[PDB]
Amino acid sequence: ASLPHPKIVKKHTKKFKRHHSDRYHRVAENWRKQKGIDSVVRRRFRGNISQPKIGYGSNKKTKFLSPSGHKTFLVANVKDLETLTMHTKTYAAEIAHNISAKNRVVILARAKALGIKVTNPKGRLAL
Amino acid sequence: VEPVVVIDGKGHLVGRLASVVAKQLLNGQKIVVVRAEELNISGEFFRNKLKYHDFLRKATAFNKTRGPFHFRAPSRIFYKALRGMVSHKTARGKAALERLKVFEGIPPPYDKKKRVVVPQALRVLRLKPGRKYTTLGKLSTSVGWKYEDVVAKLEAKRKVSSAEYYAKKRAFTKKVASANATAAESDVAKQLAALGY
Amino acid sequence: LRSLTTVWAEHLSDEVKRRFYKNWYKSKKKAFTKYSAKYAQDGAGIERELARIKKYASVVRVLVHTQIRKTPLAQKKAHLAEIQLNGGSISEKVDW
Amino acid sequence: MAHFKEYQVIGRRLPTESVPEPKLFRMRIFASNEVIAKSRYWYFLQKLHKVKKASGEIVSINQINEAHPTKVKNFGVWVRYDSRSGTHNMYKEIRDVSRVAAVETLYQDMAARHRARFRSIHILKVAEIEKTADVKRQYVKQFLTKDLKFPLPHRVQKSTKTFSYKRPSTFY
Amino acid sequence: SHRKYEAPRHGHLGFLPRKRAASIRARVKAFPKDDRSKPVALTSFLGYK
Amino acid sequence: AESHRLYVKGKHLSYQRSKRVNNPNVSLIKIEGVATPQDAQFYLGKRIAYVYRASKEVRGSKIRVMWGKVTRTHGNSGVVRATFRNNLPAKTFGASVRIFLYPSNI
RNA sequence: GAAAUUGUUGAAAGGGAAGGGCAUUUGAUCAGACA
RNA sequence: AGAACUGGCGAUGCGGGAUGAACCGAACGUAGAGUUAAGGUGCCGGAAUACACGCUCAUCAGACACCACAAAAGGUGUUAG
RNA sequence: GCCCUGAAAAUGGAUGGCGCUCAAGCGUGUUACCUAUACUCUACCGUCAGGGUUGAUAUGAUGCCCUGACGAGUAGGCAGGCGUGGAGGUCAGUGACGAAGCCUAGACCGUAAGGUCGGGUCGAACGGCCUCUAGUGCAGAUCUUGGUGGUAGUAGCAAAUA
RNA sequence: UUUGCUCCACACAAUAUAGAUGGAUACGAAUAAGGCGUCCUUGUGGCGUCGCUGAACCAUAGCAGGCUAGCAACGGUGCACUUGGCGGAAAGGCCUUGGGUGCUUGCUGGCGAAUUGCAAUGUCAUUUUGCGUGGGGAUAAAUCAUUUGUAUACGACUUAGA
Ligand SMILES: [Mg+2]
Ligand SMILES: [Mg+2]
Ligand SMILES: [Mg+2]
Ligand SMILES: [Mg+2]
Ligand SMILES: [Mg+2]
Ligand SMILES: [Mg+2]
Ligand SMILES: [Mg+2]
Ligand SMILES: [Mg+2]
Ligand SMILES: [Mg+2]
Ligand SMILES: [Mg+2]
Ligand SMILES: [Mg+2]
Ligand SMILES: [Mg+2]
Ligand SMILES: [Mg+2]
Ligand SMILES: [Mg+2]
Ligand SMILES: [Mg+2]
Ligand SMILES: [Mg+2]
Ligand SMILES: [Mg+2]
Ligand SMILES: [Mg+2]
Ligand SMILES: [Mg+2]
Ligand SMILES: [Mg+2]
Ligand SMILES: [Mg+2]
Ligand SMILES: [Mg+2]
Ligand SMILES: [Mg+2]
Ligand SMILES: [Mg+2]
Ligand SMILES: [Mg+2]
Ligand SMILES: [Mg+2]
Ligand SMILES: [Mg+2]
Ligand SMILES: [Mg+2]
Ligand SMILES: [Mg+2]
Ligand SMILES: [Mg+2]
Ligand SMILES: [Mg+2]
Ligand SMILES: [Mg+2]
Ligand SMILES: [Mg+2]
Ligand SMILES: [Mg+2]
Ligand SMILES: [Mg+2]
Ligand SMILES: [Mg+2]
Ligand SMILES: [Mg+2]
Ligand SMILES: [Mg+2]
Ligand SMILES: [Mg+2]
Ligand SMILES: [Mg+2]
Ligand SMILES: [Mg+2]
Ligand SMILES: [Mg+2]
Ligand SMILES: [Mg+2]
Ligand SMILES: [Mg+2]
Ligand SMILES: [Mg+2]
Ligand SMILES: [Mg+2]
Ligand SMILES: [Mg+2]
Ligand SMILES: [Mg+2]
Ligand SMILES: [Mg+2]
Ligand SMILES: [Mg+2]
Ligand SMILES: [Mg+2]
Ligand SMILES: [Mg+2]
Ligand SMILES: [Mg+2]
Ligand SMILES: [Mg+2]
Ligand SMILES: [Mg+2]
Ligand SMILES: [Mg+2]
Ligand SMILES: [Mg+2]
Ligand SMILES: [Mg+2]
Ligand SMILES: [Mg+2]
Ligand SMILES: [Mg+2]
Ligand SMILES: [Mg+2]
Ligand SMILES: [Mg+2]
């Protein structure tokens, strides 16, 4: 359904994991810049891992766009859903995770009526 | 070009035959080297006797096993010669070396196969005449190789059964050329003649 | 050097047959029975085998074995071994 | 240096008010390009006159093409050079087709027989040996004898395939 | 440093290794020369000390 | 006939590389019987296919191909740089690649 | 009822450590997208 | 061990010098293409077993700045003077 | 000039290795070729700068739009942000038709800190946005307390007569 | 231990592949010398010839090569067979006889081919294994335990037991 847009180029799709996150259990993959003096990573000796930096920043056009083309949006009831009433080619609706079973089925229903996208439409669906 | 390429070693210089056998090998051309003992090395036989004895002392001190191994047969004096020019520790490396065989003399399969030369390692061409140089088998025999007498014995025997081969051949290709000239001057022949044959 | 063939006799003392085993008493002692065959037919195969040796064979050795039974040992299992032959002409050798 | 041209370079001290029309001096100069040549001019003339380019002026630079460029000639070369200990004077004879062809194989045979590099060398005079038997060094004389002939044995075909299937032959 | 008093080593490296042998029947590592001109006969024999 | 070949045989030599950093986005090709950079300028552009097999039948076959194009001459000996759709798998170094006669100019 | 750490099952690799970077073959697995 | 001017290293990766704080080259946002620096091109290794003219045969040859050494003195070895 | 003599050290061994002798050595000349995070052109990101534009009747004025240059970094400064415990206002937010938590080489957004969903397990609570507040972020500190390994089914279990 | 094994044949099914795609095309020796033809007195011989690259040689036309007729030859060649011989360096290959049979593009004919839509490798090699079939052929051992002491820390070794 999506609004037309450039080919989305992603610039660095791999996840930037922390230095030595792989080494000791206690170090979480969670990125963290190294402050050492001798740190081969910090100095950027060739062959160690790559560090997040602003050149890696995505294109100001395709930024945020998921595959479809729609900038997504957490939705929790129907009124929330309706904020997308006039932008079904720009935003999609992502039903919140806490949203009950029976409530989702209304929200979906209205999404269909309004013509609004729903990303996670099999969420707690009786089947 | 060919599936396999047999190289008569005779009159080739160790380090050059190597260098080329290396690259034939790394670009995936299966190569086998024969008559390895009849191989040459720059320098009078004695200098190369020496050079080899220096190679001989190099051995792991605490255990003469795990250290350098000293191979005597001319084929393997050639194989070392060759292994040095190959990234032999890597995959890629073992890969190539597998596509190679080195032989003193000319054993079965290979003696009925034709075998080629590598003009850029041919000694007679390469070396300056009057330079002193060195045969492998004689260098190898002087450093503990046990099998020179035997080799040149079978060789002499093989070199006989294959003169007969060539004799027979030379007579057949006489009739062949004899027959190919009773065809001379005829129409078809004059036609090919004109298309360059 | 490389073993090109052996050629064995026809009958074989249980003394040497013993050697080719580890649990004799139990086994069926089939050792050297299909070999003992090849004599049945005239000889033929045994012939060429010997004949092969002569044509080639640069050296020749005998397969002998101790008659351990005559020795006061308790062993039974006799001792088999190769022995070089150092007399004239390989062809004369195999005949011997 | 490269492949040499020969140059007539010409210059003169600048006009003074009291000395207009200075005396003008030339050199034949052996250089690979006109720039190196104008350099050498000053290099040498400064070793000879109260001048330096700053107080001087180039007046003409022209190339000098071989008299009879396909006439084999017998050159006698005179050279000052610098070894590792002292400086030195040499005469060598060179047989070749032009002054410009020789003066390269000169510089070459200095580079190789005495490891004298360009900077280290002064071409004092290159001049043709007119009448033979005034060839005095012998490796040239060796080539003046009548009905000279010589063969070129042990001939080498430079193979163009990695492998070959003959086994060659050095006949010629 | 260096020794103090040189004295000859122990043992004989020619007999290494000093493992158990790989069979009770030591091996005839070599045989007499051959002169094919004498009569043919054996070159050894089997025994019991 | 016996022959069905409509391409030239080529080996897959190296990646384009420095002395000690290689660059998989460009593969270097040895075209048979092409041994000078001039003899090589003929093949510039001619699409390259590297055929190979696998265990899983796919779109009906047990044969897949990666596809490329000769793009320039390499050095002084008719070696040749090519780029493919996906880069070539380095196990293929010294394997057989096929160079075609299209898009031709004769 | 997390982690360290352990048992079973399933898959994979391992010629004197293991882990990592760029790239791609292979297997497994997955989104989106068509209309 | 100590001063002067500058350029660096420290705080700095990238290419070359096999290796290396200080040398050569060049200073970094993420990338495509082209071309180069210094340094290379028998094979390891991308790239001429290219072209040319000499010199050198070492029973301890020689093989590239910083750089990982050698001198006096000698040779009827051989080269050009 | 090159080559030889002069030229003696301790684990086995280094023109970087193989190896090379009309060289793959020494000197010198000519061309071609190889490849840096440098140079040229283009795309994207960010930074700084210079212009444009409040005119309604629609959606950001700290905005919207054109354009040019630039981008290393320890100690250190500043900036814009991410995340936690509680507080004011709000969404008449979420939820026993399943809140919080936890597992999950399953999905997506971000350069990143982190954010969102799916499935599973679970059982009573809990979020978004504008503000407020601080006992507010861990890999270290021979760090505190607890818990757990490799060592390892190992050292051992042998004095005092049986 | 539920009909298990092996060699020859096909059948399905897997699984692999350092990388088929006309042919690895056989003297030896010399290199300041040789190859070949030829004559002879058979020699370190006479005469001639060639080289200067395999850019050769051989093969190569037919639905990835279908279905057919005929002439000329009496040749080639593929296959299963049979005769005699050779080859141990790793021989596992070479050669030769004789029938049978397919093909022959040596030459002349009849027919087919599209619609894979303008390219998409457009699939034709050989790897190892497993499951049933039926055509020959074959009916053992080793280990634990016990035991000896030519051996031994334990394993191991060396004996013995229908
Ligand atoms: Mg530091
Ligand atoms: Mg440190
Ligand atoms: Mg560090
Ligand atoms: Mg999104
Ligand atoms: Mg590899
Ligand atoms: Mg040959
Ligand atoms: Mg000679
Ligand atoms: Mg046999
Ligand atoms: Mg007794
Ligand atoms: Mg000058
Ligand atoms: Mg002492
Ligand atoms: Mg519980
Ligand atoms: Mg691994
Ligand atoms: Mg990857
Ligand atoms: Mg400086
Ligand atoms: Mg400091
Ligand atoms: Mg600094
Ligand atoms: Mg720097
Ligand atoms: Mg450099
Ligand atoms: Mg160095
Ligand atoms: Mg400088
Ligand atoms: Mg190497
Ligand atoms: Mg290369
Ligand atoms: Mg030396
Ligand atoms: Mg040396
Ligand atoms: Mg110097
Ligand atoms: Mg010299
Ligand atoms: Mg070293
Ligand atoms: Mg040295
Ligand atoms: Mg070199
Ligand atoms: Mg030069
Ligand atoms: Mg040079
Ligand atoms: Mg130049
Ligand atoms: Mg050129
Ligand atoms: Mg760089
Ligand atoms: Mg860049
Ligand atoms: Mg730019
Ligand atoms: Mg910065
Ligand atoms: Mg809060
Ligand atoms: Mg608190
Ligand atoms: Mg839940
Ligand atoms: Mg659930
Ligand atoms: Mg409760
Ligand atoms: Mg605190
Ligand atoms: Mg607290
Ligand atoms: Mg902690
Ligand atoms: Mg810690
Ligand atoms: Mg414990
Ligand atoms: Mg226990
Ligand atoms: Mg114990
Ligand atoms: Mg105790
Ligand atoms: Mg059964
Ligand atoms: Mg002959
Ligand atoms: Mg006669
Ligand atoms: Mg004759
Ligand atoms: Mg031919
Ligand atoms: Mg037809
Ligand atoms: Mg046909
Ligand atoms: Mg073989
Ligand atoms: Mg045909
Ligand atoms: Mg097919
Ligand atoms: Mg019984």
Side-chain angles (χ1 to χ4, degrees):
Chain A
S2 168
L3 215 68
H5 65 87
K7 182 154 315 190
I8 301 194
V9 230
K10 271 305 202 225
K11 212 160 216 168
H12 195 263
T13 56
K14 198 169 183 169
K15 182 173 183 118
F16 284 88
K17 303 182 202 166
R18 212 233 237 190
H19 184 48
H20 277 308
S21 69
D22 57 317
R23 180 161 254 248
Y24 317 115
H25 276 303
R26 80 186 111 113
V27 174
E29 324 208 91
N30 275 96
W31 175 251
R32 210 121 299 190
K33 161 67 80 122
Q34 299 276 336
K35 315 311 181 322
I37 26 181
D38 310 338
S39 180
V40 304
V41 153
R42 191 191 64 61
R43 329 236 233 113
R44 312 181 185 113
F45 283 89
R46 175 241 293 165
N48 281 109
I49 70 171
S50 330
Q51 302 183 135
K53 66 168 84 163
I54 211 62
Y56 276 129
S58 273
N59 193 304
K60 219 150 66 254
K61 256 67 157 315
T62 63
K63 194 171 188 165
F64 297 128
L65 310 198
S66 54
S68 75
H70 306 118
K71 314 208 204 191
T72 118
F73 184 121
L74 244 200
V75 60
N77 34 68
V78 147
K79 174 182 172 276
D80 272 288
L81 194 256
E82 302 188 314
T83 24
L84 309 184
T85 267
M86 279 313 301
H87 322 90
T88 64
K89 319 188 81 52
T90 301
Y91 283 68
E94 191 145 352
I95 292 185
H97 76 260
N98 41 45
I99 301 321
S100 71
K102 75 200 215 96
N103 248 325
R104 292 160 116 105
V105 317
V106 175
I107 285 162
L108 278 202
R110 184 135 190 75
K112 188 140 154 297
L114 280 177
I116 285 162
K117 188 128 148 62
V118 162
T119 65
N120 49 327
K122 298 169 212 172
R124 281 126 95 132
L125 274 209
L127 200 264
Chain B
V1 45
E2 314 195 288
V4 193
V5 165
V6 193
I7 331 195
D8 190 326
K10 194 177 158 312
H12 293 82
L13 302 176
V14 155
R16 291 208 209 232
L17 188 61
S19 175
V20 329
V21 167
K23 243 299 160 30
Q24 282 313 298
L25 249 212
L26 289 178
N27 298 332
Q29 168 69 84
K30 318 175 146 101
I31 285 260
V32 11
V33 191
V34 291
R35 288 216 281 167
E37 63 281 43
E38 291 285 272
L39 203 63
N40 306 134
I41 302 173
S42 357
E44 77 180 312
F45 164 90
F46 194 79
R47 307 195 10 93
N48 276 319
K49 181 100 204 305
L50 285 227
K51 303 206 125 138
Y52 189 82
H53 273 270
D54 303 335
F55 170 85
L56 237 7
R57 23 207 319 279
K58 282 161 191 56
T60 272
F62 40 101
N63 203 326
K64 264 74 172 198
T65 299
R66 46 213 315 173
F69 294 88
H70 307 80
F71 277 74
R72 315 296 215 274
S75 80
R76 257 151 172 299
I77 264 151
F78 181 56
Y79 182 74
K80 175 210 164 181
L82 223 155
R83 193 231 235 186
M85 296 153 200
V86 165
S87 202
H88 72 82
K89 266 181 189 163
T90 78
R92 167 92 180 300
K94 303 221 176 92
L97 294 197
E98 275 189 39
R99 319 180 188 126
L100 174 65
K101 292 198 201 290
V102 185
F103 279 141
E104 31 267 331
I106 312 184
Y110 306 91
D111 43 24
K112 315 251 211 56
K113 258 70 172 180
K114 116 127 290 186
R115 54 216 140 240
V116 317
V117 283
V118 190
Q120 46 150 230
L122 240 10
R123 193 211 84 241
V124 31
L125 286 174
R126 254 299 161 182
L127 233 11
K128 174 135 109 88
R131 290 307 185 180
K132 305 192 56 38
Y133 70 100
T134 299
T135 272
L136 217 53
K138 240 67 179 184
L139 183 60
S140 287
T141 222
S142 58
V143 301
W145 176 42
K146 310 224 216 96
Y147 299 135
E148 175 178 354
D149 287 326
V150 180
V151 160
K153 168 186 216 60
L154 302 175
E155 265 287 284
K157 163 201 294 189
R158 170 229 140 208
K159 283 175 201 280
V160 156
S161 303
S162 161
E164 299 201 315
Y165 164 72
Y166 173 74
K168 248 181 99 301
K169 159 171 299 157
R170 194 181 28 188
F172 176 68
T173 43
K174 230 193 296 165
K175 288 168 74 168
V176 159
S178 122
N180 193 99
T182 135
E185 192 61 13
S186 131
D187 274 292
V188 33
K190 301 257 296 171
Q191 300 180 233
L192 289 138
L195 295 153
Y197 290 74
Chain C
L1 276 112
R2 141 169 139 67
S3 60
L4 169 145
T5 345
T6 92
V7 203
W8 301 78
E10 173 171 33
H11 333 270
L12 232 59
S13 192
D14 291 25
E15 292 191 271
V16 231
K17 276 169 160 286
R18 211 65 102 105
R19 168 55 46 192
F20 299 110
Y21 279 107
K22 295 298 214 45
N23 299 270
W24 176 248
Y25 71 124
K26 281 211 303 140
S27 57
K28 339 275 256 42
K29 304 172 179 38
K30 314 284 319 310
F32 282 104
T33 74
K34 286 190 177 54
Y35 192 85
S36 273
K38 319 176 123 255
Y39 284 74
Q41 33 103 340
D42 54 274
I46 309 316
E47 295 304 279
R48 197 75 245 162
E49 291 330 285
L50 274 345
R52 172 111 40 55
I53 300 193
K54 314 201 195 177
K55 201 181 200 211
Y56 306 102
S58 204
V59 322
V60 165
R61 300 175 184 166
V62 201
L63 267 142
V64 297
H65 84 89
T66 83
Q67 280 197 52
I68 231 176
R69 43 188 218 73
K70 287 165 161 72
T71 279
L73 278 173
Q75 182 105 334
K76 298 183 193 233
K77 194 184 203 176
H79 281 75
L80 178 81
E82 287 178 19
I83 292 189
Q84 176 129 314
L85 238 35
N86 258 14
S89 153
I90 37 91
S91 175
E92 295 182 86
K93 285 179 204 269
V94 30
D95 272 59
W96 189 99
Chain D
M1 200 179 44
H3 197 10
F4 301 82
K5 299 158 185 49
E6 184 175 46
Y7 284 103
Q8 181 200 215
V9 194
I10 308 190
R12 69 200 178 98
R13 346 173 68 257
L14 288 149
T16 98
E17 163 219 326
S18 90
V19 196
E21 301 150 284
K23 212 214 281 187
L24 261 170
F25 314 87
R26 158 196 183 267
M27 294 184 68
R28 280 158 87 96
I29 275 288
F30 267 134
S32 57
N33 83 78
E34 300 209 16
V35 173
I36 290 169
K38 299 208 289 177
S39 190
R40 295 319 285 170
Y41 177 73
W42 290 133
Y43 166 79
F44 288 114
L45 176 49
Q46 286 189 37
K47 262 184 196 59
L48 293 177
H49 268 26
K50 245 315 160 46
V51 282
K52 59 177 186 193
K53 173 218 239 102
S55 41
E57 162 180 285
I58 261 84
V59 193
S60 187
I61 168 59
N62 319 67
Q63 184 175 335
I64 306 161
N65 298 305
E66 185 61 51
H68 310 272
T70 27
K71 194 270 213 89
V72 177
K73 317 162 208 221
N74 276 339
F75 288 96
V77 206
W78 287 272
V79 136
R80 182 213 252 213
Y81 90 104
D82 272 314
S83 59
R84 304 195 190 136
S85 318
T87 113
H88 302 320
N89 305 265
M90 259 171 207
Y91 163 84
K92 272 150 150 294
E93 320 196 295
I94 309 184
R95 176 163 164 95
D96 200 331
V97 203
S98 63
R99 309 165 48 84
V100 113
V103 103
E104 185 172 28
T105 42
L106 191 197
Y107 273 118
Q108 301 291 134
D109 197 56
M110 295 298 289
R113 294 218 155 97
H114 308 288
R115 268 71 199 225
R117 1 243 162 189
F118 196 106
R119 44 175 189 242
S120 272
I121 296 218
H122 298 34
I123 300 322
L124 302 179
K125 166 165 166 188
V126 164
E128 164 176 337
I129 289 187
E130 194 65 59
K131 37 177 167 196
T132 161
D134 288 322
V135 180
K136 302 178 119 72
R137 235 121 274 180
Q138 107 151 177
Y139 42 63
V140 177
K141 210 132 204 165
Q142 218 195 207
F143 279 148
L144 297 196
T145 97
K146 194 171 163 181
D147 299 5
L148 192 20
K149 306 197 180 190
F150 56 83
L152 291 170
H154 195 60
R155 140 133 132 328
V156 281
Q157 329 267 7
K158 194 193 62 62
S159 175
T160 38
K161 279 169 68 168
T162 128
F163 305 101
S164 156
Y165 299 70
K166 240 164 285 291
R167 181 141 242 139
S169 196
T170 37
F171 88 88
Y172 203 21
Chain E
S1 185
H2 85 64
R3 262 190 181 256
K4 168 75 174 152
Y5 299 125
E6 254 105 294
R9 80 180 320 272
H10 297 267
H12 186 340
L13 319 171
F15 290 76
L16 270 63
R18 222 101 128 166
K19 80 197 301 241
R20 300 216 253 294
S23 168
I24 59 283
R25 194 167 64 76
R27 283 168 305 127
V28 195
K29 254 78 174 326
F31 277 100
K33 175 129 179 174
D34 195 3
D35 148 80
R36 280 99 116 102
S37 103
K38 292 298 108 213
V40 161
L42 257 48
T43 36
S44 35
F45 220 60
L46 250 45
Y48 298 89
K49 177 163 170 178
Chain F
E2 44 197 10
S3 6
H4 291 91
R5 185 166 56 79
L6 274 155
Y7 57 76
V8 169
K9 312 192 235 165
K11 281 304 198 162
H12 179 198
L13 292 203
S14 195
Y15 286 158
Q16 163 197 19
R17 54 181 297 180
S18 296
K19 164 112 94 170
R20 289 212 254 71
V21 143
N22 73 19
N23 163 51
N25 307 293
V26 165
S27 252
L28 302 160
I29 305 302
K30 174 54 175 165
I31 287 140
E32 281 211 327
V34 170
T36 135
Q38 291 74 55
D39 273 49
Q41 253 271 204
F42 171 62
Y43 296 64
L44 290 221
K46 304 275 180 313
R47 343 185 44 72
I48 305 199
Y50 161 57
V51 195
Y52 68 100
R53 303 174 193 267
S55 311
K56 211 205 309 187
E57 183 151 350
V58 256
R59 290 170 45 268
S61 191
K62 287 195 193 285
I63 289 203
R64 318 162 184 176
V65 185
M66 337 196 196
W67 273 84
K69 82 233 258 173
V70 174
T71 104
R72 48 185 269 150
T73 37
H74 204 52
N76 275 5
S77 296
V79 234
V80 118
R81 308 197 191 175
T83 76
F84 290 79
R85 242 194 122 261
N86 297 113
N87 307 4
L88 277 203
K91 196 182 262 174
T92 39
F93 282 140
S96 301
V97 98
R98 302 168 175 194
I99 290 96
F100 280 92
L101 286 168
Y102 53 93
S104 82
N105 249 84
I106 19 184

